[PDB]
């Protein structure tokens, strides 16, 4: 019996079960093999629809081709003009996904969108509560809006 040995009891061991991580050297070899396999899938075009997570304006959008997005502000782009979304956090297919840390490289993912409509929101009523509230102590907020159609999500074998 070695020094500091405790017989098995309810409190002898922690409730959790310690897990053994694989040694780094073997994992790196497997990591490269996994990356190589996925790169061939991209290279051979073995995928269907792609979905990407894109940071645009101040929000993140799960995006796929033919999708419609509404932006709650003016964008300075003419209607019908094509755009590139440049902050992609995730691009995914049926069998694989790529995650940025925090953003994917331009070489990997190109997401293209088009401005379909520049509009204004419907009137939103902003009325605070005050002594002698009244019905006319009211403000209407109308905000410019932009509608973008996602056109394509493309990937290249540059892992």
């Amino acid at each position: 019996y070695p020094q500091g040995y405790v017989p098995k009891t309810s409190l002898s061991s922690p409730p959790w079960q310690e897990v053994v991580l694989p040694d780094p050297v073997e994992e790196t070899r497997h990591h490269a093999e996994v990356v190589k396999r996925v790169n061939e899938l991209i290279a051979t075009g073995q995928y269907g629809r792609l979905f990407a997570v894109v940071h645009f304006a101040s929000h993140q959008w799960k995006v796929t081709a033919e999708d419609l997005i509404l932006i709650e502000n003016e964008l300075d782009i003419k209607c019908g003009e094509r755009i590139r979304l440049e902050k992609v956090l995730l691009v995914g297919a049926d069998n694989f996904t790529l995650l940025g840390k925090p953003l994917l490289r331009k070489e990997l993912v190109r997401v293209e969108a088009t401005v379909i409509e520049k509009t204004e929101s419907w009137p939103k009523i902003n009325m605070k509560f005050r002594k002698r509230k009244n019905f006319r102590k009211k403000k209407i907020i109308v905000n410019p809006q932009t509608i973008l159609r996602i056109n394509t999500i493309e990937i290249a074998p540059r892992l």
């Binding site: 019996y1 070695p2 020094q3 500091g4 405790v6 009891t9 409190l11």
Partner: peptide, 21 residues
């Protein structure tokens, strides 16, 4: 051969002071 000789109590000669319920 208790794991912790020199313990007075039989509980401490086996390192069970605070580990049984």
């Amino acid at each position: 051969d208790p794991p912790n000789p020199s313990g007075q109590c039989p509980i401490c000669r086996w390192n069970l002071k605070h580990k049984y319920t």
